[PDB]
Paper text:
[name] ([name]) participates in the elongation of early autophagosomal structures in concert with Atg2 and Atg9 complexes. [name] belongs to the protein family of β-propellers that bind polyphosphoinositides (PROPPIN). The corresponding primary structure contains a series of conserved WD40 repeats forming the 6 or 7 blades of a β-propeller fold. The autophagic membrane adapter [name] reveals an unexpected structural plasticity in multiple modes of oligomeric organization.
Using these preparations in high-salt buffer, we determined the single-particle cryo-EM structure of soluble [name]-WT fractions. Due to the very small particle size, i.e., the [name] monomer corresponds to 55 kDa, we imaged over 1000 particles on a single cryo-micrograph. Classification analysis revealed separate views of single [name] displaying characteristic structural features of blade separation of the β-propeller. Alongside [name] monomer particles, we were also able to classify a selection of [name] dimers. Comparison with projections of the T and I-interface dimers extracted from atomic model of the [name] tube matched some of the 2D classes. Moreover, we failed to reconstruct coherent dimer 3D structures of these [name] dimers presumably due to higher flexibility in solution than observed in the helical assembly. Nevertheless, using monomeric class members we determined the 3D structure of [name]-WT at 4.8 Å resolution according to the FSC 0.143 criterion. Next, we successfully docked a single refined atomic model taken from the helically assembled [name] into the density of monomeric [name]-WT. In accordance with the helical assembly structure, three major loop regions were not resolved and disordered in monomeric [name]. Together, the structure determination of soluble [name] supports the occurrence of monomers and dimers in agreement with the T and I-interfaces observed in the helically assembled lattice structures.
Numbering used by the authors: 5 to 65, 74 to 156, 222 to 320, 409 to 445, 459 to 499
The structure:
């Protein structure tokens, strides 16, 4: 049975990306189905555009970009050190190494600017997916107090904008709103979650997670920037309303192994019936929540945006089959 090394949604939450030890696979969420998969070789990093049949492909052990609808190679470039993580927009290319970060235009593929960054073995970044507010942020720890410094960078103008004293320690997890107005960061202790307004840098929401310090894997904003989701080694997913303590609680089933990396995302609100699902009026709106885990399973949840609390489990598909 194949193992899996990477999980990430698209920029909208309508697809599933994966690179396996024997290939890669891409999926869709609402009308569950299989688009594409190749059993070529091992891989490390996979990312997508807003669909458009373009893939970011990295070998497990260079960057290769492939058009799946064309089954052909668009371009290919080499880097000195091992690649760690990238994300995509409609106007720029962003790639990071442990001490270097590179930026390119998506269309013409030519290089634009190079920034020599401090060591980031974890390699956590955050970049807007919108053109008119294209902003990218990376941590700036001092070269071994002021440990939690982040740099606010504009891909349209290729210049730094502002510096924020976000956290007291090393940076752990970052995400940026769909419209690029908000950015949230995670400390190593994971007790304090802070999200800011990008243009002014003023802190707007300060959040408390859990009781004892646990690591934080990743976080993700919603399309309307109303809710934020957190994933950690406590196998528990907490959401925080952006409209303190956690608003509502997500609990993965017991049979799931604890040492799992899990990625979550938030979609547009939906209306569902109360008849088929014993939630405990025919229709009242529900917010869908999707969580895909590195153990190889998908889960569907529904969110009550007044009551909060535990969310009921609806259905679970099993990936790789």
């Amino acid at each position: 049975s194949p193992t899996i090394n990477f999980i990430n949604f698209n920029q909208t939450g309508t697809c599933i990306s994966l690179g396996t030890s024997k290939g890669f696979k891409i999926f869709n969420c609402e009308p569950f189905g299989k688009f594409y998969s190749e059993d070529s070789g091992g891989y490390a990093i996979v990312e997508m555009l807003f669909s458009t049949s373009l893939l970011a492909l990295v070998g497990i052990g260079r960057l290769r970009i492939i058009n799946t609808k064309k089954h052909s190679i668009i371009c290919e470039v080499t880097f000195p050190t091992s690649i760690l993580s990238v994300k995509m927009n409609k106007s720029r290319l962003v790639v990071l190494l442990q001490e270097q970060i590179y930026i390119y235009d998506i269309n013409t593929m030519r290089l634009l600017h190079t920034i020599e960054t401090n060591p980031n073995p974890r390699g956590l970044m955050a970049m807007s997916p919108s053109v008119a507010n294209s902003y990218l942020v990376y941590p700036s720890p001092p070269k071994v107090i002021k440990n939690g410094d982040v740099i606010v960078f504009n891909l349209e103008t290729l210049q730094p904008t502002m510096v924020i004293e976000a956290h007291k320690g090393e940076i752990a997890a970052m995400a940026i709103s769909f419209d690029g107005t908000l950015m949230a960061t995670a400390s190593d202790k994971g007790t304090i979650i802070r999200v800011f307004d990008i243009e002014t840098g003023d802190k707007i929401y300060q959040f408390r997670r859990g009781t004892y310090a646990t690591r934080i894997y990743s976080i993700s904003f919603s399309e309307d920037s109303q809710y934020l989701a957190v994933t950690g080694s406590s196998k528990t997913v907490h959401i925080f309303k952006l409209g303190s303590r956690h608003f509502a609680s997500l609990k993965l089933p017991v049979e799931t192994n604890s040492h799992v990396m899990t990625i979550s995302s938030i979609g547009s609100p939906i209306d569902i019936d109360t008849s088929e699902y014993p939630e405990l009026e025919p229709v009242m709106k529900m917010v869908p929540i999707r969580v895909v885990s590195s153990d190889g399973y998908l889960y569907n949840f529904v969110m009550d945006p007044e009551r909060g609390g535990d969310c009921l489990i609806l259905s679970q598909y099993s990936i790789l089959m």
